[PDB]
Amino acid sequence: KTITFLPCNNESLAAKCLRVLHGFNYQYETRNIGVSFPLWCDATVGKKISFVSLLKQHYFVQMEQLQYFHIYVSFRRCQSIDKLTAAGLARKIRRLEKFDPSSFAQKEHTAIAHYHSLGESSKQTNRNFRLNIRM
Amino acid sequence: SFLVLPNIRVCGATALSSPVTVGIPSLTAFFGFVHAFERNINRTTSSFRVESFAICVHQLHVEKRGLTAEFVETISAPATRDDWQCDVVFSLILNTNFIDQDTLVTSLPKRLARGSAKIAIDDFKHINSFSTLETAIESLPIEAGRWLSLYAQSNNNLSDLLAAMTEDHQLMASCVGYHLLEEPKDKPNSLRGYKHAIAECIIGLINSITFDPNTIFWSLKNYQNYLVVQPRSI
Amino acid sequence: GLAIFEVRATLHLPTNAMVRPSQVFTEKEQNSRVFQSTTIDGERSPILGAFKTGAAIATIDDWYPEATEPLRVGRFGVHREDVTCYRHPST
RNA sequence: CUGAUAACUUACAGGACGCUUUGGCUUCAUUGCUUUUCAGGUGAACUGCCGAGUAGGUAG
Secondary structure, eight states: OEEEOOOOOSHHHHHHHHHHHHHHHHHSOOOOOEEEOSOOOSSOSOSEEEEEOOTTSHHHHHHHHSSSOOOOOOOEEOTTSTTSSHHHHHHHHHHHHOOOGGGOOOOSOOOOOOOEEEEEEOSSSSOEEEEEEEO | OEEEEOOOEESSEESBSSSSOBSSOOHHHHHHHHHHHHHHHTTTSTTOOOOEEEEEEEOOOEEOOOOOOOOBOOOBOOOOOOOOEEOOEEEEEEEOOOOOHHHHHHTSOSBSSSSBEEOOGGGGGGOOEESSHHHHHHHOSOOOOBOOOEEOSOOOSHHHHHHHHHHSSOOOOEEEEEEESSOOBOOSOOTTSOOBOOEEEEEEEEOOOOOOGGGTOEEEEEOSSEEEEEESOO | OOOOOOOOOOOOOOTTOOOOOOBOOOOOOOOOOOBOEEEETTEEEEOOOHHHHHHHHTEEEOOSTTOSSOEEOOTTOEETTTTEETTOTTO
16 A cells, blocks of 8 residues: 655655564564655655555554555665765775775765665664665 | 727728828818717617717828729710828727727728728727726727827918928828808708808818827817817817 | 628749739829839838729629620629620610 | 718830959057955764675675
8 A cells, every 4th residue: 555644754754664664574574565655756755655565553553543644666775875974984994904004095086876865773772874775 | 988999990091181281181081980980879879979089090101092983974984183092000099978899890980081991800809998098098009109189380371381391290281170161051952961061171280299188189179160170178 | 780801812822923913093294013002010012902802802793785704893884804885875 | 970972004025245443651668456354054874794805785
């Protein structure tokens, strides 16, 4: 089904829907159901979220009671974009030591094509990351 | 109340306004165009009665077109005369006493001094009636033109006329009214059963205003001695 | 009854070809063919006159006593091609 | 109710032949553009695994 948001921020709201899809897949140990957004426009991810192959989980039911809900292409994570930040460039060098560290050099000119990260976090640790998703 | 008649394209008129001047047709002919329009509406609405009118001339073009007369009875044509004709395009504004589109079109007179007077079908939209002078003059298209007031300054002579003509070249003398030779009497045959008199043409100079209102609106005044279409101010 | 018509033609001539407008009738006191004209926009332009146009609509009369070609409607209906009078009053 | 009422200007056409504009020429002296000037949104999109790897993949 397609869940259409009608109240806002589509970035930090579609990322919450995937965390419920995340925690569902470790209770039941299933990896079949996938996610895609029909309105994947350049300005924003969109207000439409669909799953193909969840609505009985506690998140989607309580959000349904309020005024806001309704309840080919490939969307894959690109973790090379997580390596392009300068905190991630230092993570890359620490592995290669574990050797001249001054022999390395920055790119000084990089171009990035439409990475669309959705911000999420971990529950095993207290640590944050992003969902850099392209077509 | 003001009624607007735009774009009366006349094909073959007489430029002979007088036995003297050749140019725009006599103002009595413009008065006959208005008063026959007044008289056609009185078939349906019998209280109409136009008081005055205003003329906005575009595009004269006076030419010596000929006129082939028909054969007359021993059958030949009569004697020939040089003919001066003109092609007046003008917008007429009338001050009404107080009407359907079908009534306004079919009551239009179809001649202006022997010339085919017509309005295009695409200009039938612009026959609306207005209550102020400002909205009527902003309503009509074909903006460049003249508004035809009378020139009232001491023309007792042709040398008085030509002195005004050489100062401003576009000053346009014509026939303005009629001057009687004898008081009207009963004749055995007169056109439509009225008293008949014998008159003569009165020549006046005709100005133009850039655009106050009484200088523009023309009307027919009746005196015992003569008849002249004057502006309302004079 | 009113019945306005607006007629408009579309003539496809050859390359660079002649047009034949109407022409004037004046008394003689060098130019041997002078056209009738109006002013359209800011320029002179040949016309085909209003009396010339009305004489073409009224070529109906094919009831004169030896009728072959229709004549222009009028009293004792004349032919200006051959200078004669069909429907002469002796008929 | 308009110097009112009515109105076919038409046909035909060869402007042509010939043509040296040219000579001469100094634009040239002098020259101070200067004084003073915050682009800021950087709390953060982290930490591991695989690989011989400034390649490239994936975990939370």
